[model samples]
Target chain A: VNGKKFKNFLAKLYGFGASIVILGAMFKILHWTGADLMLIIGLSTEAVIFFFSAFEKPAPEYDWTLVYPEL
Target chain B: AQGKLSPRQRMINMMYLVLTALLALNISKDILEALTKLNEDLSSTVMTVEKKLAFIYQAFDLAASENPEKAGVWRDKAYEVKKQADELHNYLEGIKNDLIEITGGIDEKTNRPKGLDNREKVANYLLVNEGGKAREIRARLEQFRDNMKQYVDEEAALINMLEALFNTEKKKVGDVMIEWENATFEHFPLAAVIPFITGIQANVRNAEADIISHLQRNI
Candidate 1:
């Protein structure tokens, strides 16, 4: 697809992978060591990734001269 | 930044995943034979150590029931009890080593692994310096410690009783056999010691069975 769509998809995938890794770590730590902090970090990491990805600069690129000349 | 995991974080994840897999397999009896052995060794040693305490009760009984001459002999019988206690202490080193090896180290060579895995330290760091979290975990840990004092004290009392049992007072030879019998036979559960004590008793009484009417008839 186009660069804008591709970048968005890449960001989404990155966010999802990071979030899963964090969650797995948190659960394992909680089960084995009873540490709840890992759970928090695991959750926050996903939120941060998703937040940045969703809010990052997004726009379609085009040849502006064609549009402006018609206007 | 969150979208990309640092190399170190990835390493931690892999390490944790492997650790979790290993923990999952901890219940597999065949794989955990060494762990079983370690636990058994500790338990056996504790039991053996605890057995020595029975001598105290036996000593008390003999001193109270036997003739003065006999009691004197058993009272001096304390040295053997002391020897058993010393041996138990030596064996405990191996037991402690087994426990240490099973749980991995706390700080490099230490056996205390109480707080290594939870990322609690990292959270504590954030809570203290970065201003996060609802409350301090250390405080909660301290509260837990306070709440467990009664249970901890009872456990300590049990352990101390075992220690005291292992330590003995000097006694006379007359009381020794009675104390020994009580400690080795009477104090133990009948199911565990009957076969053992009965075998020895049979051997002792059999040699004189012809002369003693009870022995002659009972066997």
Candidate 2:
């Protein structure tokens, strides 16, 4: 079975990191004070996530047999 | 047999770190330029997806002519899905237009907004201004999702992805509630919001791809 639960968990992780990266960008664009720290924290988190994401196996193929039923 | 990455993935990760470390420039102006490039690429993506969508609809048109009793109804449903998706897609394009108008017109040379770092106009218009459309978009997108859901009920996986994509509900952040509209538009540079709406347009088209393609299989 494909790891649905694991996939969802990783989505949350990636989503969190992505938001931080976005925050960094926004703060940086506006010339806010915390931009540097935000980018550092966010990019570091993303780097770790990129490292982790490599382990996720490619998903199984789509099943069209039920839809078409020409099988 | 599992739990480790291929050489390609490993090398890609290594490359990313090396690049990340290489440049930590101040780059506020360069940041604006970067987002401008990203926005143009996103706009390009939307156009490409539309071409693919039109191709699918052409197939539907041909299908309808083939066997009236079999493929006809599915073709019509696919068309309806296309109509709804287009409605949302155009709505967002208009929102992007409004953003462009408020942020100052596009600079002809770059075809990107003249005010990439302009936050006041964007924030005031999309947040403080009562006419701000961010809320309306959430309403329309949620409605659009409901409309698309009706056609793909049989495919649980498709339904799941579509729901996740269009959900506009408040997200729990630490203790306080964060709204989708505010989180999206509040204090955000025009540079970011333009691409964001463009990305939503891409999502709308991608949703069109999923449900319409599902409708096709019934034929």
Candidate 3:
């Protein structure tokens, strides 16, 4: 994919990982013990992915320049 | 020079980037629904305010009829305040109606405009991307505030209080510094923005009510 599309994909992936980590922890705290070994492994992987995602260099910022030339 | 990154770093960067896109798409639906609920609440509040304002006017008329010497002046001032509030409120309502027209006309079932969840329609029509109606609305707001200041007392207490509700100053949110129009309307769903504009109308009416209340006390 191109730079713009690539960034979009990355953003969605990061959100997925971040959501999984937070929700998993919350569910665990609430004593919903439905998660088994595979689920735990999957969530751990997501957390690791998020760790790297959080530290990665951010993409170039986009705005309405292409559409609204005034701004 | 840009070099090839490790696979893990690349994946992380991709994830972060995609997260933004996903959140923008997903949270938008949530925000639209929330704004729809808020608009209903604001509308009901407006109805209540209308009832209260009607009572206030009726009371003023009765008092003025009974004792015109003292109550006449207060009644006149209160009516003037109401007139100014109505002028501004009507202007804002016209804009709201225009926005509704731009978004595919009103729905037959709900009697509300269709496409409340449509971002592109509003962003292209009401926002700066196309028609730039927000700028016009902003100018009128400034003029309305200036007109309302004439009713303030010598101490300017009412004017100062109204400024808190009406100022168009720039705001800072996280790392982005946004101007009043852009911060308020840009990229925001029509559903949410309708409530905001309607909220301003409500605020104008409320201010009018406050001025009337104060005048009644003095009388």
Candidate 4:
């Protein structure tokens, strides 16, 4: 549950997606060419990343296995 | 324990940092004081600019008397500029007074409006159910700017400024574009709103000054 490497990897994905989204929005606002392409790329990546985020493993509960041994 | 931080401790520290930053967002008393100071100065400028308008009008009268044939046309044109500008300026003055009145009139303590720090009240008054004074002011501003065209028809620089200062174009803030009225008076502190209204008054005067002086060229 506390896999730092896994969390770091996901955080990087988030940073990349967030950066793309911001740039895409700026391009749209400024009327730059290829804004539609950037928006579609950024937003779809964000959606995919968000969808994967839901499957993140939950933290472990109390260490009750020690007490419940063979019971 | 002294050298290393725990995850729990780190989060608590981060949240504490965030809380402190959020607390800092509330407008300081001195900031409000400064805005009031700016408003006072702008009002004085309005008067200062007014006297200039008066001086020119006086000069125009003198000119009209001296050369009724040549100067009379420009003098009449100058008067019309003043007339339109005065009408627009008076409307802005009423908005300032109304803002002060709704926020609680001049405070006996600071001799400033009591609602100087009020944020929501200003917006509530301006952005009511069916649109309010803010919208009307926009209409007046646009009309006044547009009205200048007849006076400075070929003057590109004047036309540029008139378009800018009295611009009603929607503004972009954050990711969303908002109407100028919302960008202006909506949800802003009375201290902020008052100066802005006065600044608009200043803008109106400046435009009058520009147009009047241009007409002065004719004389």
Which candidate wins on lDDT? Answer: 4
Question: What is the interface root-mean-square deviation of candidate 3?
Answer: 8.4
Best by DockQ: 1
What share of the reference contacts is kept in model 1?
Answer: 0.09
Cα lDDT for residue B74, candidate 1? 38
Candidate 4 lDDT, B1-219, residue by residue in tens: 023457899799678547534522547889999998998899998999998789999999999997799999999899988899999889888988888897779989878899787665576567652576789888999899888889995898998899899889888877888998888877578989989989999999999998998999877
Off by over 4 Å in 2: A1-71, B1-27, B172-175
What does candidate 2's lDDT look like per residue over A1-71, in tens digits? 32778766765776676567667767766658998788888778877767776676764657999798997
Task: Write model 3 residue lDDT over B1-219, tens digit each, in one string.
Answer: 375566677667656644532443423446666778889899899979988999999999999999999999888888887887888888888887877888778989987677675667677766555558887778877877877776667436777768877888887756888888878787766687799889998988877887777778887
How do the residues A1-71 of candidate 3 rate in per-residue lDDT, one tens digit apiece?
34566656765765665556545444443335652332355456656655655655655556878989988
TM-score of each: 0.26, 0.64, 0.65, 0.68
The residue ranges of model 4 lying beyond 4 angstroms of the native Cα positions read: A1-71, B1-25
**Per-prediction interface RMSD in Å:** 10.7, 4.9, 8.4, 15.0
Predicted candidate 2 versus true structure: per-residue lDDT over B1-219, tens digit per residue? 455556687568556644554333333677777887888898888888888889989998898897888888888899888888888888888888888887888889976667776777888778678866788888898899888878985588898888888878787666868898887777667878888888888888888887877887788
How many backbone clashes can be found in candidate 4?
0
Per-residue lDDT tens digits for candidate 4, residues A1-71, read 54777688888887897798778777544434454466568668766776867767655555787899864
Q: Which pairs, if any, clash in model 2?
A: none
Error of 3 at B202 (Å): 1.6
